[PDB]
Amino acid sequence: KVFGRCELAAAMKRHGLDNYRGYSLGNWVCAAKFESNFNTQATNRNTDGSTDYGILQINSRWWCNDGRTPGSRNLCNIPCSALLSSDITASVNCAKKIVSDGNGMNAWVAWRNRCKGTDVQAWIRGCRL
């Protein structure tokens, strides 16, 4: 499923990501934009053998168990296929654990490169919410 910008903004806002651990809603919408282009089915296979899943491109090496990654820890305690659903609930709950660490949203590389430091409230612009 491919989300609209405002449509995803409402869903993320509903799941309590606005200002969660100090990161405003505009950050989360912008992160999902460059990470997966608002596409819940996006998966990018890494060279090391791990895979990134879903709208937030969560890596299987630490966070989820896809069954094909050697030495994985499954910190979110979920199967990686749950991050590919059209309901972002599993992605949001896993993401809340990730951002709680000392690295914050720097765990998402595309967010660090493109969204971090810019005017992120542009993404929630024109959205009812």
Side-chain angles (χ1 to χ4, degrees):
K1 186 197 174 183
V2 170
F3 271 89
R5 169 178 64 85
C6 285
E7 184 201 334
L8 178 64
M12 286 186 175
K13 175 151 176 79
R14 195 174 308 116
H15 287 84
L17 289 177
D18 186 19
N19 202 47
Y20 183 87
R21 279 315 204 101
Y23 290 100
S24 86
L25 184 69
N27 281 261
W28 295 104
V29 175
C30 190
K33 160 69 174 192
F34 298 112
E35 287 296 350
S36 72
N37 205 14
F38 299 143
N39 167 37
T40 64
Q41 286 187 326
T43 81
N44 166 233
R45 294 164 160 75
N46 290 186
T47 306
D48 61 358
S50 65
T51 315
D52 305 310
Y53 293 95
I55 197 150
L56 285 173
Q57 295 290 281
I58 290 174
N59 208 264
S60 62
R61 212 157 123 263
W62 293 335
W63 307 108
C64 63
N65 171 79
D66 62 354
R68 311 173 275 274
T69 309
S72 173
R73 299 209 77 185
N74 193 18
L75 294 178
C76 289
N77 195 39
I78 40 104
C80 291
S81 67
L83 309 172
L84 285 193
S85 163
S86 58
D87 185 322
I88 68 181
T89 298
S91 288
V92 175
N93 304 316
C94 185
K96 283 184 187 166
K97 298 172 213 289
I98 298 176
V99 80
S100 286
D101 287 11
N103 207 4
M105 277 203 88
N106 289 306
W108 287 280
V109 185
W111 172 88
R112 200 180 65 255
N113 288 344
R114 315 278 304 263
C115 307
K116 169 184 175 188
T118 80
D119 192 15
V120 287
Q121 50 108 41
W123 296 100
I124 67 171
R125 185 77 70 181
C127 295
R128 181 173 282 115
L129 305 175

